[PDB]
Every structure is written in C-alpha cells, then in structure tokens.
Write a protein that binds this ligand. Structure first.
Ligand SMILES: O=C(NO)c1cccc(C(=O)NO)c1
Ligand code: NA
Ligand code: NA
Ligand code: NA
Ligand SMILES: [Zn+2]
Ligand SMILES: [Zn+2]
Ligand SMILES: [Zn+2]
Ligand SMILES: [Zn+2]
Ligand SMILES: [Zn+2]
Ligand SMILES: [Zn+2]
Ligand SMILES: [Zn+2]
Ligand SMILES: [Zn+2]
Ligand SMILES: [Zn+2]
Ligand SMILES: [Zn+2]
Ligand SMILES: [Zn+2]
Ligand SMILES: [Zn+2]
Ligand SMILES: [Zn+2]
Ligand SMILES: [Zn+2]
Lengths: 174, 174, 174, 174, 174, 174
C-alpha cells in the first residue's frame, strides 16, 4: 500500500534510512558500554563515564529523528536486532577515545553514502535533511575525538595513569 | 538589459520563480476559499475555518519570499492572473482536508521541479533557498494533512457529523 | 435553500458584495506589485516598498471582512479570478502614488454604488456596515495619497531623483 | 580477579543482573517501536505515541540503574544483543496497550525471580534494591495499563476509531 | 601524513579552501583601505567610513571560519601574502560602492566555483558549508551594494556633493 | 596638495607611520597563523589558540589606530602587501611563545625608532601618541611573553607534552 503522504521517496532511500536507524542505535549501545566501563571501581574515571553517557543519549536522539523522518516521508520503520558492542572491556581512556573516533568515521561513511543515494535519487529533501542534521555534527564529533586522542597521547597515555586522571579532570570535567 | 546584481541566475530559473509565485498565490486563494466555507452558518466549524485561514496567510508569505528572491538575484517579477479555486462549496471537513493534501502535493512537485532546475543550472544559491525555506515545510504540511485525513476517516467522517464537530474541537481547536 | 439566517438581504446586494470582494482582492494585488517594484535593485526605495506592502495587506483585510459580512447575512461567496495589475513596471514613486490615487477613487466609487444599492433595497444594516467600515477609510486614503502626490510634485519628482529619495526617508520612513 | 569492593555478592546474582539489564533494554526497544507506530500518517495518534516514547525512555533508565548497581557491587557488565520487538505493526491503540500489559507482567516475573534469588543468597542489599526501585514501579505500571485497556474496551475499541481518538485526547493528552 | 580526522576531503578542495582564505583576507584589506579613505579630512564621510570598516571586520570573520573549516576537515592551512588593494584613493562614495560591488561579485564567483568543486568531489559537507555560511550572504551583500549604487546615482552623485553627504546621513547613518 | 589640517608633521614621520601600519598588520597575521596552528587536531591546545587569536585582533586595532593618526595629522595612508608569516607550522606552544617574544621586541624596536624620529623632528604630539598608546603596551606584552616562556621551560616543555597541556589549562585558560 502506498502512503497518502509519500512523494519522491525511493524504496532504496527508505531501506537506507532503516539501516541508518539501526546503526545509530548501535552507536548509542557502544557508548553506553564505554560509559559504564569507566564507572567500574577499577577504572573510576567519572568524567570519561559522563562524556560517553552523553554521547549515548545523543545517538539515541539521532536514531529517533531518523524514525520521524521515515514516517514524515511515508516510509515504514523496520527495526532489527541491536548487536552488542565488539568489546566488554575498553582498556583505557585513550583506547575508548580511539574506538569512538573509528566508530564516528564509520557512521560518517554511512551518512555520506546515504547522502549520495539521495542525490542519485533526486531527493533534495532527504539530502538537505542529512546535510542539515547529520553531516556537520559528524565532522564536529570526529574533530573533537581527534583533539582528545591527540591530547591523551601527548600527556603520556595510556601508560601514564596520571595523564588519564588529569585529562578526566581538566578536559572532560568542564 | 542585465541587472547589476545578476550573477549565475539562468533565465529559466527566473521564469520558474515567477511561476512558483503564481502557484503560491493560487494556493493562498484556495485556502481563503476553504476558510470561509467553514464560516457559513450551515457549516459552522470555526476551527476548520481558522485552520485554513492560517494556511492561506502562510501561502501569501511563501509568495512574498519568492518575490524577494526574484529581486535579490536580479530577476524581474511578472505577475499573472490568480485563478479562482476549483470549488465554491468544499462539502465537508474531510473533503477539504483531502483537497488540501492534493494541493500541497501539487505545490511540492512544482518545488522539486524548481530545485531540479536549479541543480541542472549549477545554481546552488537557488537550490539551497528552495531546500531551506520550502522543501521541509512542504513535507511537514503534507504529513500533517495526512494525519488529519486519517483521524477524520477513522472517526467516521464525513457521514458522522459528530466526527467533524469533535475533530474541530479537539484537534483543530487547541 | 434559503439560509436560515437570511433576512432583508436582497439578491442584488449579495452579488454586489461578491463583486466588491473581488475588487478588494484586486487592489491588494496592485499594491503587492507596486511594493516589490520598489524593492528592485535599480529602484531601491525601501519605504515606498513598505508603504505599498502595508496597503496590500490592508486591502486583503477589507476583502475578508466582506466575506465575513456575506456569511453573516446568509449570502453565498463566489470568488472569481484575480486579474493581474495593469502594469509590471510602476516607473517611479510619484507615478505609483498617482496610480494608487486613481485606484482608491475607483474603489470608492464602487463602494458608493454599493451603498446606494443598500439604501435602494432598504437594507440599513448593509448601509451602516459600508459607512462604518469603508467610507471614511476611503476618504482618508484618498486624502493621504493626494497629500503624497502634492509633496512629491512640489519637491521636483519624478525628474529630481533627490526628491523621491528624501520623500522616502522623511515622509514614508516616519 | 575479585573486585576490591565485592562483598556478599553471589555469581548467580551477578549473572541475573546482566540478564535483567538486557530485558530492560529490550522493553525500551519494544516501547520505541510502539511509539513510532503511532507516529505513522495512517495511524496518527500523537498521545499514544508520546505515552510509549516516555515508557521507552523510562526502561532505558531502568537498565542504566542496574548497570550502576552491577558496578557498585563489583560485578561485571556483559552486554548482549538487544532483540528486535515481536511486531513491526502494532495494529491499534488497544492492541499496543495489551501487548504492553503482557510485557510488563513478564518484566515483573523476572524481577520477582531476581528478588527470590537475592533472598536465597542472603543478599539483603540486592533484595532491597529490587523492592525499592522496581517492584512497586512494576505494580503501578501494570495497574495503569490495565486501567487503560479497560477504558479502551468499554469505549468500543478497536472497532470504534472514535474511541481511540477520544482516549488519545482525554486520557493520554493529560 | 594523513590527518586522523580526514575523511572524504579532496586535496583539490583543501587547496581551493586555502585560496578562498587568502581572497577573504584580501577583501578585508580592500574594505579597510576604503574605510580610512572616507576618514580623510578632505573626504570626511563618517558613515561611509563606518560602513566599510564593518565590512572589513566581516571579511576577516569569513576568513577565520574558512580556517576553522580547514582544520575541522583535517586539511592544512597555508597562508600567502595579502596583496594590497588596487587603489589608494577611492575617489568618492559612489566609486567605492561600485568597487565594492565588483569585488563582492568576484568573491561570489570564487565561492560558486568552490561549491562546484565540492559537488564534483562528492563532498556534501563542504557543499552545505558553503551554501549555509557564504552563498546567501554574498547575494545579500551584492543586492545591498546594488541598492546603494542606485540611490547614489539617482541622487546625483558623484557630481553632486550634497548627494553623498545626505546619503551618508540618511542611509548609512541608519 | 598640503592638507588643510597638516601642521608640524614631517614627511619622514608620515612615511614611518605607513611603515608601522604595515608592521602591525604583519604582526596581526603572524598571530592569526599561530592561533590556527594550535587549532589543528594534531596540536589541539585550545587556549594557546585563543591567546594568539586575541593578540591578532589586538595588533589589528594597533594598525587601525595608526591609520586614524595618519588622517588626524593630515598625512596620507599608503598600504603595502602584508607578507605571510615566516612559518606555517609553529612546532609547539613554547616555540610559538618564543617566536611571539621575538616578534614583539622587533615591533618595539620599530616604535622606539619612530619615537626617536618624532623627537628629532620636534613633533611632541606624535611622540606623546607613541608613548601613550604603544610603548608601555609593548613592555607589558614583552614581559608577559617572557613570563610564559619561563614557565613553559621550567615545566619541561617542549619535550614533556604534559607541560604544554597543563600550561594551556592553568595559565592560558583563565
Ligand atoms: O545530481 C546529479 N548530477 O549533478 C544527478 C542525480 C541523479 C541523476 C542525474 C542524471 O542522470 N541526469 O540526467 C544527475
Ligand atoms: Na450610520
Ligand atoms: Na525493604
Ligand atoms: Na543545503
Ligand atoms: Zn549519530
Ligand atoms: Zn556519533
Ligand atoms: Zn548533482
Ligand atoms: Zn506554499
Ligand atoms: Zn502549502
Ligand atoms: Zn479596500
Ligand atoms: Zn484601498
Ligand atoms: Zn523496566
Ligand atoms: Zn516497564
Ligand atoms: Zn567574505
Ligand atoms: Zn564580502
Ligand atoms: Zn602592535
Ligand atoms: Zn604586539
Ligand atoms: Zn630631547
């Protein structure tokens, strides 16, 4: 059945949107995992925990806004299993920041391919949606993650436990 | 002779803007007509009337923003007759909502064609103007009209006059 | 079917009211065109543009009030095409003021004939509606447009470009 | 290694907490799916949508509190796949409420089993944690969903689309 | 070596961004020269001076935003000499406005080619960046400078010294 | 033509002012370059970045105040190219601070030469302008840069990246 609102909305776009939803939920789950790793009594970096929890909720928001878009265009949401993150133990603050950087670039890659698909399907509403709500947000996230990684390395992480403690206090704790 | 401001603005784009201006004014007129139909003593659904009156003033703003665009880019406004709406009697709250859904999808198609023209002529300023001020606005309006049609049908409109009364009070009143 | 509210409302009055609605919508379109003429980069008189845009919105209000009247008396609104204005290029500040003066006296003449009809058909509610909401408004607008024409001429418009510039600042910019 | 903070915390309890964490995230996902079903243009019950979205966010908060508890007691969080919900189409407001009632009773059964485990292992901290933060919350949610199912049924849902519209307005649009 | 943040950022885009930075700094320098020309005791048009000083600071801001973009995408900033402006003596208010209009259309052309490059390299983040922060700003500036040129000519500049004096007071003195 | 305001202002002084203007603009540009070096994702010292960006805007004010001086005394501004800075890559917080110290002592030497010129030409207005707005500014800036260099070296910069991180946080960040 075709939705009464659907217009210029290609089935491949609809499917790409469903895959992006699962990917955002996945990213949120990875960040949830990292957050409570820093909450462990044998890690105990509360500002790393808080930073990654904040990222988790932002990713959930990303997924919900894609779900809204799907219904706005008259597509149909099909949710899939949310796979568990690849690690249970994230080793260190630097390691988590590096894993997060890798994650955000993979999510960025998927958004860029979604945008190319919108361009190729002459769907300028979908292209502007990705441009407006996702692309610069990804670029900021990756730059910020790059910055943190750089500082942690220069301070002597992951070896120096002083480095991660001070970075938690002075960069991530306001 | 060429406007001192004109730059990268194709004659076809200038012509299409003039057509969109007339379409927007025509939409305003359709909504004005619907609004005062619901103001009749034998229809008397005041929130339907206010809903379409609001839409009608918004369409006039859409027209005026395009006329400003025409002047910003160095084009020349040529106005045309505004054709009267296709009905005098809009029959029911449900029928008018369906007629509005159809209208908004017609205007959306015209905007997508305009955006495609801008992209074909490598006019990114006009393409972004269309994306930023019109395309998501159309998607939102189409989605809301669909929502309203769905609710009125499910409530038993247009047979059950109880349904249009209660929809006027509880969704359009607010 | 007669309207359950119709009382002392002649068929001729009803049709004259439909004609006046179209005429007010026409005046509104004329003023809209004048306004965006003065917004052109090669005219660039922002307070003339503002002045005419205000008149255009006022004419729309005049039309909607007559549509409301039509329904209050149980007449039936029939809208017609809105004819495009007579000019696309309004030439100058003084020319547009002269054109607006001509238009307003023509609209006034139609209202006077509308009032004469109402008196002929012994419809004092319609007669008072016209006297109250339209007649002194037309007299005021005509007097104001006369004042503007007089000052523009005395300052040396249309020949003197300094004239329209300073009039735009000191009279139309408050 | 044994956590330096671990005390009176049985391995079975630790594992049962990891299961409960997965179950609460699962319930969050079910409610997320229900929410955006009601956002569909062909369902369009915004207060049903808002209600289930609020339950969704609350379940994720339930999950996070259990993750906090695991770390507090020196257990170790192991996340698992979050299984997608059992439907993609939730049929109606009444059917979604009924599915939620059934979900909440299953979540409750697993919390009662978790409490029984805590008592069996003579873990009063965990027993009281469950009583304080989950048991009455489940009982209130189950009671409210039963109230909602009862009202929807007596109003004539799911047959009467009027019933669900008014329930959405008058009970969930609080 | 490659930046840890760089993704989908073509070396051609990187180099065009370095060029655009130098061009913005150049525009800034042109407007600075214009400003203090009007501050001369034998020119003494204080609002022309303020108007151009404000544009000079805006251009510097445009340049720094491009420097920020370069680093966000992981390109590398290379500054070049900032070439002195084409004139030391800007002759008159109208001449400076004509020169500014010419410069802004040149800056605009360079931005349109930047956008075309970003579209060619399938870089929708860069494309949206230019659309969002530069394209309508250029169109607005070009339209405003056109308006100023038109009014100055119409008032009798450059010949009439009264004209530039009064324009300075009534238009540029807001 | 001699300016109607010129009095006791030697052509050598006028020429030296034009050179100081260019030197100040040059200093602004060096600081702009340094600022965005510390904004790179592989450097990422945000308060180093803000510190030098502030110095950049300050140098620009210095240039502008000299340009106003040139006009007040009836001299004529002649702008020259602004040479790009001597480096693209500023290496480290410590290296930049040492380079800034060298730059400020260079600008101070030029101002002392300017002041000598004014005293040699019996231009006490220009001598006092230089004393009041520049000479103590330079001494303060040189003192501050020395202080900063001293602390970075004592903390173990530029080897210990911990030192630049902590200096950026505790000295440069309020
Ligand atoms: O964005 C485009 N070009 O820049 C584009 C997108 C889809 C189709 C086509 C095409 O094949 N037109 O003929 C072009
Ligand atoms: Na009267
Ligand atoms: Na208890
Ligand atoms: Na865009
Ligand atoms: Zn995301
Ligand atoms: Zn992300
Ligand atoms: Zn394209
Ligand atoms: Zn519209
Ligand atoms: Zn519309
Ligand atoms: Zn009127
Ligand atoms: Zn009028
Ligand atoms: Zn729960
Ligand atoms: Zn629950
Ligand atoms: Zn610029
Ligand atoms: Zn500019
Ligand atoms: Zn200085
Ligand atoms: Zn300095
Ligand atoms: Zn001496």
């Amino acid at each position: 059945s075709t939705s009464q609102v659907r217009q210029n909305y290609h089935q491949d776009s609809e499917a790409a949107i469903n895959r992006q939803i699962n990917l955002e939920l996945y990213a949120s789950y990875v960040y949830l995992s990292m957050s409570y790793y820093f909450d462990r009594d044998d890690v105990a970096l509360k500002n790393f925990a808080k930073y990654f929890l904040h990222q988790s909720h932002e990713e959930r928001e990303h997924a919900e806004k894609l779900m809204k878009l799907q219904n706005q265009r008259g597509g149909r949401i099909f949710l899939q299993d949310i796979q568990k993150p690849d690690e249970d133990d994230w080793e260190s603050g630097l390691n988590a920041m590096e894993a997060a950087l890798h994650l955000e670039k993979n999510v960025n890659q998927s958004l860029l391919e979604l945008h190319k698909l919108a361009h190729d399907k002459n769907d300028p509403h979908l292209a502007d949606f990705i441009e407006t709500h996702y692309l610069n947000e990804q670029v900021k996230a990756i730059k910020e993650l790059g910055d943190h990684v750089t500082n942690l390395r220069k301070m002597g992480a992951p070896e120096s436990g002083l480095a991660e403690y001070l970075f938690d206090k002075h960069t991530l704790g306001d």
